Design a protein around this nucleic acid. Sequence first.
RNA 1: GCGAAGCGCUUCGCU
RNA 2: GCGAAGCGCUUCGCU
Length: 338
Amino acid sequence: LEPLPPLTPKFLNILDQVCIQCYKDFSPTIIEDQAREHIRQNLESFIRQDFPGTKLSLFGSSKNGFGFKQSDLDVCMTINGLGLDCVRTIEELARVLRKHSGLRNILPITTAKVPIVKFFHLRSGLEVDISLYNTLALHNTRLLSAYSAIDPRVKYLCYTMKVFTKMCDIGDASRGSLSSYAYTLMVLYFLQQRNPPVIPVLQEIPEIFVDGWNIYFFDQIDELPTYWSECGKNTESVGQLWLGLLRFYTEEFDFKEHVISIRRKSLLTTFKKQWTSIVIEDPFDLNHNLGAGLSRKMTNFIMKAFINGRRVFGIPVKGFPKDYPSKMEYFFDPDVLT
RNA sequence: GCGAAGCGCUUCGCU
RNA sequence: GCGAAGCGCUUCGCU
Ligand SMILES: O=c1ccn([C@@H]2O[C@H](COP(=O)(O)OP(=O)(O)OP(=O)(O)O)[C@@H](O)[C@H]2O)c(=O)[nH]1
């Protein structure tokens, strides 16, 4: 790794604005939020024609406080008043949805760990994923939402990370990379682990079980000053934290021995979890390693993207060539980061 | 035993 | 469907 020159005050002010701009440019307007709602509304009534009692609910970015323009729509389906063959139900869902003049490219994915019917929504141009009884997903949505409300910099960094993985083309788990949900967990972990914490761990501040998993977490975001020790302690700018995250995952954190675990504050090791051979534990489904599908080719691309991320965000310059219309295209240049 | 392409086949992955 | 990793066969290659 290269030595990094000291941060100037003014290159850091640029880092702060660039991170905040990631939130403003990509957080959704009310019109986009409601377009998603309508999609959930319409599909529910349409599916109810064949499967009465069908309840659809959104989760993921559409509802976890990290809504991101043009993200795919995550939908969880259950049936009110209800050993359900999920493989068969996904194909049943597919057969139903091909009759919808507003949908195209209906595709059932039965063999995935989480089976989904994936399709394209004409009016909105969004891609939609319907899964069945994805109840843990509804709860990690509420949990991320609680983190998103603790401190403004949590959104700023999570948005900046979503922009970054998109440009580096490293955020598609269907092409062997990591999923957005994984990167968000990496951000929240980094903020729980830096000294002093920016966020606490909310499931350490009660046993509520769903699918045999304790889904409890502290969620009254109006009263953490009472119950979180290091509240208000960390004063650092968002641009320092974003460069801090890139350095944290390229210089300090040892992926070979430690699990990225937002559920509890202390170190969780590769050895205890039997996950010896990037390792990320789901906040609730503790048997699910979100890095279990990574190739070592793919881990290298991710590591390479983080390293050039460290370079362009860490080497001060001013100015920037008037070629660029704004700082955004300088920092998030896809060729540079790849 | 090794490389390239084509045509088939299988296994793993995808919220 | 898409991504990855294999196996079959054929054709052409191995100094
Ligand atoms: O490994 C996974 C992946 C996905 N999911 C669940 O599916 C949802 C959709 O997962 P996505 O991969 O679509 O992430 P996203 O665009 O919603 O981005 P984030 O806000 O999640 O960073 C995620 O928000 C998560 O709740 C899991 O529970 N586990």
